[model samples]
Every structure is written in C-alpha cells, then in structure tokens.
Target: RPAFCLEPPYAGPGKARIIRYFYNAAAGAAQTFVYGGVRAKRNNFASAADALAACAAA
Candidate 1:
C-alpha cells in the first residue's frame, strides 16, 4: 500500500483525478509520487517524511 494518497481539493474539466505517494527507506531511500498529467511519474526524495509529505501538498 502507498504511504499516502490524495484526491486534491481542486477540480476542473482537465485535472487529475487522484494521486498516490510511495516511499521506501530501505531501497536507497526511494520515493515516488503523483498519478496524473505531467506529474504522473516516479521521483526520489532526500527524506522519508518529505516523500510522505508530498502527497498532502499535492
């Protein structure tokens, strides 16, 4: 399961439906976030908290 998931407070005709955030401190501290549009891709973070935080500030 994801560390965090979000359904943003914003809405429009052409906006993302949802976003998910994942993080793993054991595997090179990997982090991936989001699930729509250009932001729909994996990423890395310096801290696990930041990875988890990314979902909220989405």
Candidate 2:
C-alpha cells in the first residue's frame, strides 16, 4: 500500500486541512492535519473514510 494525503471541503479561503493515508503494504492508518486557523493534528483513524468523515465534520 501507498500512503497518500487528500484535501477535504472547507469554506472561506486558504488551505484548511489535509487527510493523510498511511500504509505499510498491509496495515493502514489515517491522519488529519489542520492548518490556517486553529492548527491541529488528528491521528489513529483506522481508514481514510473515517479520517475524511472527521475532517468533514470539523
């Protein structure tokens, strides 16, 4: 598997957040990196879907 990051929906200017997918051939993990306003880092998501959901919710 290949680790990758994606951009989620955010309103009102600048880069808001990023959703990253990390994998080591078999197992995988997802993370969220927030920027621009109120910087934060969210991790330990089991899949990209979960990470995206969290990002969308935010």
Candidate 3:
C-alpha cells in the first residue's frame, strides 16, 4: 500500500501557494511526498504513482 495519499481538492490554490512558500523556506528540510494539483480522486495505483513520481522529481 502507498504510504501517502492525496485526494482531489487536496488543497486550495491559496493553501498550495503557502505550502510552496514554506517548502522553499525550509530549504529541503520540509519534505514532501507528492505536491501538485489533483486531477481526480485517488486510488491505490494513482496515489503510489504520484508519490513515487514526487520522489523521483525530488
């Protein structure tokens, strides 16, 4: 099973903006598994894919 999951509307644009700001401020200390606008509802496969993709991108 995926260790992390994010549902649709995971965060509003404002929240996402704040997250990006704080994440940048942390300078890699604040970790993220997956960060993006959700395209749809999450399932195991999609969640795992998103998490892994985030890891790769990180």
Candidate 4:
C-alpha cells in the first residue's frame, strides 16, 4: 500500500473540501480519503461530508 499525506488549505465558505480516493490496482480496491484542513477543526466533519456529497454528485 502506498501512503500519502494530505494537507488542506482553508477555503472560503460554500466551497467543498478537497478529497482523493486512493486505489491499489494491484489489490483491486480503493480507499476514500478527505481533507478539510486542521484549521477547520470546528467544521471538519461538515466539510468532509460536503466533499462526500460532491463525489456523489459527480
């Protein structure tokens, strides 16, 4: 498995947090990851959910 570090920079309100889905093709599967910035601890869950929603919309 390959490890990656995601550091999210804050964005203004109404913007969705960034996300990445890492896939290990050799393993034939994937894992979803989200980042909303440590500075946004208060709204991290909210932002993460937004990112999930965005993925769903795609």
**What are the Cα lDDT values of the candidates?**
0.41, 0.37, 0.31, 0.36
In candidate 3, where is summed lDDT lowest over 10 consecutive residues?
17-26
In order of appearance, the predictions have TM-scores of 0.25, 0.26, 0.19, 0.23
Task: Give the poorly placed runs of model 1, Cα more than 4 Å off.
Answer: 1-42, 56-58
Q: Give Cα distance to truth, residue 55, candidate 4, Å.
A: 20
Ordering by TM-score? 2, 1, 4, 3
Residue 43 local lDDT, model 3: 23
What residue pairs clash in candidate 3, if any at all?
Answer: none
lDDT of 1 by residue, 1-58 (tens): 2433323222223355444334543553334443444333333333557665664353
lDDT of 2 by residue, 1-58 (tens): 1122233322224474544332222223343333333333233244667654554444
Best-fitting candidate, scored by lDDT = 1
Backbone clashes under 3 angstroms, per model:
0, 0, 0, 0
- The collision pairs in model 1 are none
Candidate 3: residue 47 Cα off by (Å): 0.4
- Candidate 4 residue runs with Cα over 4 Å from true position: 1-16, 25-27, 36-58
